[PDB]
């Protein structure tokens, strides 16, 4: 057996992961470190079910997530190194011609927009793996 749904206080479980819905005005790199210093990382998203869960708890005024154009060539990848095997980009996003808009945020609808990394948003989402109880 082995059930993996234990999360630290203040975190919320969904499937095998734990999620922290942070509040407080931050630009992307600041949110990146807030997550890191809590033993998590800016969230990566891998299914409709996981997106649906995030949308349910998402801040209405937008949140930083863990997707960024790290290689500076137009390919948006997860900072946690996980596979890009799902997307919820808003229609037309990411824009082909938007130099500098390398960071990614999630709107209240849950759909993703690129953004200048120094934009200030009032929310940001972290994740980490849940720990497990022995059967």
Numbering used by the authors: 157 to 291
Article excerpt on this structure:
In its membrane-bound form, CD23 consists of three CTLD “heads” connected to the membrane via a trimeric α-helical coiled-coil “stalk”. We have determined the crystal structures of the human lectin-like head domain of CD23 in its Ca2+-free and Ca2+-bound forms, as well as the crystal structure of the Ca2+-bound head domain of CD23 in complex with a subfragment of IgE-Fc consisting of the dimer of Cϵ3 and Cϵ4 domains (Fcϵ3-4).
The S252A auxiliary binding site mutant crystallized in the same conditions and same crystal form as wild-type Ca2+-free derCD23. As predicted from the crystal structure, the introduction of the S252A mutation did not affect Ca2+ binding, but unexpectedly, the D258A mutant was unable to bind Ca2+ even though the aspartate forms part of the apparently nonfunctioning auxiliary Ca2+-binding site. Ca2+ binding to the mutant derCD23 molecules (E249A and D270A, principal; S252A and D258A, auxiliary) was consistent with binding only to the principal site, with the exception of D258A, which showed no Ca2+ binding.
